[PDB]
């Protein structure tokens, strides 16, 4: 198995998810117009958040420790049992909070209390989201790129079917329910694929508790908590700088670039958690880690550069196809943003190493480094060049950050502190 082969599997599953999303999104737009989209905005962002929140963000830890103990049946059972207990316990608590506060949640999502029933349904749907993501994380711990990809592919296709039936039957609220069911229905193929492929015995998923492993998986919950604040906060007051001296139109230009660039990043690095994270988890010697990091960088940097150069050449086609034609000056932002994306992908290789070593301390330092760099560059370039400056600030940020990652890796590999 290799990073290249994992990318081949993961690209096929990600492309189907993108094609399915574009199909469902245009069906929702044609059916309910801008009024339906504006009312679905918060609800859709909640569905995204639940993809990590429903299982308490332990998923990367599940992959890390399953990989570490994939040849240790006794510990592997303990890992999966504790992970099952943590996902079951938190998802159950989440379901109770959702059903009990369905009225305040509906008010915050839609502006009134008329959606309490949909919120109460989501309280049960998020259980499928959490459990499905756990099963996928288990497969990634075994580096089963094919099982992971086939599961996501089946889930996307059945998700489109479920969305069609749901909105045809129940109108707008049925459509929203279908949106929540898209990531939840993956649990059906994921459970089937995991058992049929012989990855682990079904009994491993019975909830158990191990205090040690629970504390270790909690470290990945804490990284998930940190990640959901730092850089999101950074982009929020980046938009603040933008609106302070420019129009909302320029703000929209930048937000469109960032959101589509983030989706581009998620597609390109989706195989990192499938291959890179479990592989680096098993390796402990510095020579072996360096070899794998070097080999990964030698593959991913030319691949992403070639892909990003192609995208920049077709930036006008990418804008016309992927986004609503309400803004077409972002083309000048593509070059800067795409360069930053290439170096950010390179920086992800070091970031997944930190995940693979469960280093909470290096995770904090990596996150704070990105936040501060983003702020120094944004505070400089945004007030002078608007959305173009925001793209320049993003690019400059990850030029410096990738270089910093290399230097810190060299100091760590050479044991500068010993």
């Amino acid at each position, epitope marked *: 198995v290799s990073l290249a082969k994992a990318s081949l599997w993961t690209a096929a599953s990600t492309l189907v998810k993108i094609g399915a999303g574009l199909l469902v999104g245009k069906l929702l737009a044609v059916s309910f117009g801008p009024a*339906g989209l504006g009312l679905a905005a918060n609800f859709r962002q909640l569905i995204t958040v639940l993809g990590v929140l429903a299982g308490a963000g332990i998923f990367n830890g599940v992959t890390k420790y399953v990989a570490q103990y994939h040849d240790n049946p006794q510990q592997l059972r303990r890992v999966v049992g504790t992970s099952s207990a943590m996902v079951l316990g938190f998802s159950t608590l989440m379901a109770l909070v959702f059903v009990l506060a369905a*009225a305040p949640i509906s008010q915050g999502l839609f502006g009134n209390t008329d959606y309490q029933g949909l919120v109460r349904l989501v309280a049960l749907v998020q259980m499928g989201i959490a459990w499905g993501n756990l099963l996928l994380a288990l497969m990634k711990g075994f580096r089963d790129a094919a099982g992971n990809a086939l599961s996501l592919i089946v889930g996307s296709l059945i998700g489109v079917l479920a969305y069609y039936v749901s909105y045809r039957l129940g*109108g*707008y609220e049925g459509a929203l329910l279908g949106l929540a069911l898209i990531p939840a229905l993956v649990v059906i193929p994921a459970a089937i694929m995991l058992i049929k492929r012989g990855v682990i015995p079904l009994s491993y998923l019975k909830p158990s508790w191990d205090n040690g492993l629970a504390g270790q998986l909690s470290k990945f919950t804490l990284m998930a908590l940190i990640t959901s604040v730092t850089l999101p906060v950074a982009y929020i007051m980046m938009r603040k700088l933008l609106a302070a001296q420019y129009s909302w139109d320029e703000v929209g230009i930048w937000q469109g670039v960032s959101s589509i660039s983030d989706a581009y990043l998620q597609f390109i690095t989706a195989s990192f958690s499938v291959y890179l994270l479990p592989t680096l988890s098993r390796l402990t010697e510095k020579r072996d880690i360096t070899r794998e990091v070097v080999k990964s960088l030698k593959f991913v940097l030319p691949a992403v550069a070639a892909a990003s150069f192609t995208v920049w050449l077709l930036r006008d086609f990418a804008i016309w196809l992927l986004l609503s034609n309400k803004f077409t000056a972002m083309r000048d932002l593509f070059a800067w943003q795409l360069v930053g994306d290439v170096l950010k992908v390179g920086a992800y290789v070091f970031g997944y190493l930190v995940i693979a070593k469960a280093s909470l301390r290096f995770y904090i330092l990596a996150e704070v480094s990105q936040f501060t760099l983003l702020m120094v560059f944004a505070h400089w370039l945004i007030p002078a060049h608007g959305a173009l400056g925001a793209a320049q600030a993003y690019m400059a940020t990850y030029i410096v950050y990738f270089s910093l990652c290399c230097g810190v890796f060299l100091l760590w590999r050479r044991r500068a502190l010993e």
Partner: nanobody
Amino acid sequence: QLVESGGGLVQAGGSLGLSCAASGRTFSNYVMAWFRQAPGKEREFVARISESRGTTDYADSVKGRFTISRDNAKNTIYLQMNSLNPGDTAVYSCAATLPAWTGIIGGRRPGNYPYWGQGTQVTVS
């Protein structure tokens, strides 16, 4: 887009007539409905008239007692309420939405109507 008229304090057993006016242009394509919300509960379905064949739907609590009608000439809809019992005391609101928002069996869900009126009070002594 929607304004309500009628209602108030009525003696139990007496009749009452609510009316709702709509602005805009395209009105015959909007499904029209009445909802009510009593103090302490949530918005519940009352009655609904379609945009096409003039079909009607009623909650089991008002069937036979309440009758909804529409007039596409003046873009208004009405609700006649006979045999008013104390359980009918609520704020009554008219709602408008397109048939794609209701689907096949979602015509009773208030979240399928994005356009609402201010609401008129009905108190059955």
